């Protein structure tokens, strides 16, 4: 048993995914240049905390996605993500990127134990 509160996040990254679907519906693109950070909508679900994708250098392009981390991640290394395509992916190990109750910041490719999640 370790199924983190990805469920709360599933709605957050989703809550973002719509704001993503909208940001595009209002703009048409996210990152404008290599090494830029487009402001993310949701920063917290109900048990997870959300932030903008990884490093500005490796930020969403033609794709909009956010990653959420367990607030109790110390106990739930599990992480989640959800894009505009409403396609989520959960991880079983959160190394880099950023974590809650510590110093969340971004989702930069540094996770392990991940599979496709569907809220």
Q: How was this structure determined?
A: NMR
Q: Please check whether residue 25 is in contact with residue 19, taking contact to mean a CB–CB distance below 8 angstroms.
A: no
Q: Please check whether residue 90 is in contact with residue 78, taking contact to mean a CB–CB distance below 8 angstroms.
A: yes
Give Cα separations from 75 to 51, 91, 113 (angstroms): 20, 14, 15
- Parallel, antiparallel or unpaired: strands 88-94 and 106-107: unpaired
What distance in Å separates the CA atoms of residue 105 and residue 98, rounded to the nearest whole number? Answer: 5
């Amino acid at each position: 048993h370790r199924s983190a509160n990805l469920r709360a996040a599933h709605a957050a990254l989703l809550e973002n995914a719509r704001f993503m679907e909208q940001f595009y519906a209002k703009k048409g693109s996210f990152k404008l240049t290599s090494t830029k950070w487009p402001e993310l909508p949701v920063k917290e679900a109900g048990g997870f905390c959300i932030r903008m994708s990884g490093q500005a250098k490796g930020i969403l392009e033609g794709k909009f996605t956010l990653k959420a981390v367990a607030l109790d991640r110390e106990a739930e290394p599990r992480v989640l993500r959800l894009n505009e395509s409403l396609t989520a992916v959960v991880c079983g190990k959160m190394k880099g990127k950023g974590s809650c109750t510590d110093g969340e910041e971004i989702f930069r490719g540094n996770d392990a134990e991940c599979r496709p999640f569907t809220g």
